[PDB]
Amino acid sequence: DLPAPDDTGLQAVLHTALSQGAPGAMVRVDDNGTIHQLSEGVADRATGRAITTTDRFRVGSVTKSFSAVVLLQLVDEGKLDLDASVNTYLPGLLPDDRITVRQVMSHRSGLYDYTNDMFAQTVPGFESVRNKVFSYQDLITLSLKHGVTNAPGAAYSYSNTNFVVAGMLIEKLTGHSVATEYQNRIFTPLNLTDTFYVHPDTVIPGTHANGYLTPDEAGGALVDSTEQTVSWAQSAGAVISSTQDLDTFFSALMSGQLMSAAQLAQMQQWTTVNSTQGYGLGLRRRDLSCGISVYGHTGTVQGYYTYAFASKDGKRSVTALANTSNNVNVLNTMARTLESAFCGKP
Numbered sequence: 001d002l003p004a005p006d007d008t009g010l011q012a013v014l015h016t017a018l019s020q021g022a023p024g025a026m027v028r029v030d031d032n033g034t035i036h037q038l039s040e041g042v043a044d045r046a047t048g049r050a051i052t053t054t055d056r057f058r059v060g061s062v063t064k065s066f067s068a069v070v071l072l073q074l075v076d077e078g079k080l081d082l083d084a085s086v087n088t089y090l091p092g093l094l095p096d097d098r099i100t101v102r103q104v105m106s107h108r109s110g111l112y113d114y115t116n117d118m119f120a121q122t123v124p125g126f127e128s129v130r131n132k133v134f135s136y137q138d139l140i141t142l143s144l145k146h147g148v149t150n151a152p153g154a155a156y157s158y159s160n161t162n163f164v165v166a167g168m169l170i171e172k173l174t175g176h177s178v179a180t181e182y183q184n185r186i187f188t189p190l191n192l193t194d195t196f197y198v199h200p201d202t203v204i205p206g207t208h209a210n211g212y213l214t215p216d217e218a219g220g221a222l223v224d225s226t227e228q229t230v231s232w233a234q235s236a237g238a239v240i241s242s243t244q245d246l247d248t249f250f251s252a253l254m255s256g257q258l259m260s261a262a263q264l265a266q267m268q269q270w271t272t273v274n275s276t277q278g279y280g281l282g283l284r285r286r287d288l289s290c291g292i293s294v295y296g297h298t299g300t301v302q303g304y305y306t307y308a309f310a311s312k313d314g315k316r317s318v319t320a321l322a323n324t325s326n327n328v329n330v331l332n333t334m335a336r337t338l339e340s341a342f343c344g345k346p
């Protein structure tokens with residue numbers, strides 16, 4: 001009973017994003033078995049190669065939904081209790097035993113986000129970490145140089161630190177790398193042939209969109225940010241995928257294929273973000289103008305803005321990508337793909 005997707009409106013969104021500084025922008029809709037696919041602009045601005053909806057890209061913080069699915073399958077298996085203390089599983093990690101796994105997964109832990117220090121200056125910060133390899137503990141120690149910012153559970157405050165903890169939990173409780181767990185629990189069963197976790201490798205396998213970091217100086221030249229370790233994010237940000245594979249993943253999630261019903265319900269217990277948005281457990285809700293809510297996640301790793309959202313039953317999914325970042329006009333414009341794709345023509 002959804003409106004038809006509006007391709008003319010999608011086309012206008014991409015064209016606007018280009019006019020605001022995205023080298024390329026694209027979107028794929030899987031509408032209950034009917035595909036919509038549009039792209040405009042360039043995957044590589046120096047060579048001129050066109051962007052296309054099959055280009056792989058860095059999904060950034062969409063990674064948190066993959067990490068959350070692994071953790072919730074561990075809850076299904078009896079290996080993890082969401083209301084247990086992080087420090088019960090990782091003794092001595094955090095300065096407060098009251099911080100629970102559920103709080104970290106919903107950004108209610110109070111843990112300071114180290115990435116504000118790292119990327120205070122956008123391009124210098126990128127140059128500082130792009131070729132660094134961090135352990136999970138290194139990143140937690142960077143957070144803990146600062147006090148928590150709120151009491152456990154008390155407020156929503158997004159922090160990459162939370163999903164660094166998530167990766168440490170995954171590796172401790174399984175004895176495997178997050179790469180292995182993602183592959184065995186998600187990428188292989190869903191046949192996500194364009195989806196990878198290669199950290200700390202800097203190469204994007206196969207044909208990909210290059211990423212272009214916008215400098216903090218208005219009008220400044222773009223920086224190619226395609227090749228980096230993403231070691232500053234890991235289980236908070238380092239998955240590589242495609243529009244088809246993120247559509248498959250969020251459709252599978254919402255249609256109940258990736259965990260028990262009970263754990264999907266836990267994943268959708270919404271913490272208020274604003275009057276039109278919530279945060280579950282590694283999962284975002286956005287409320288659209290026509291009265292529809294959609295479910296998924298955004299990403300903003302250097303040079304790539306991703307939106308990947310599905311309807312409640314998974315039957316319609318949409319993934320949009322612009323290959324720039326640090327450009328709020330572009331970021332806001334690309335959100336409009338969800339309106340056109342789900343709410344259709346005005």
Ligand SMILES: *C(=O)[C@@H](NC(=O)Cc1ccccc1)[C@@H]1NC(C(=O)O)=C(CC[C@H](NC(=O)CC[C@@H](NC(C)=O)C(=O)O)C(=O)N[C@H](C)C(=O)N[C@H](C)C(=O)O)CS1
Pocket residue numbers: 059060061062115116119158160233236237274298299300301302325326327328331
């Ligand atoms: C995941 O991708 C992760 N991203 C990074 O860790 C990269 C990075 C780069 C520099 C500094 C810090 C981190 C997180 N992603 C996202 C995301 O997907 O959006 C985060 C949420 C980011 C912030 N969003 C808001 O502040 C949204 C407010 C909300 N409300 C309305 C009604 O106003 C809304 O707009 O929906 C955020 O920081 N936004 C800015 C614009 C931003 O993303 N800045 C970076 C530099 C960019 O534009 O590239 C948290 S990090």
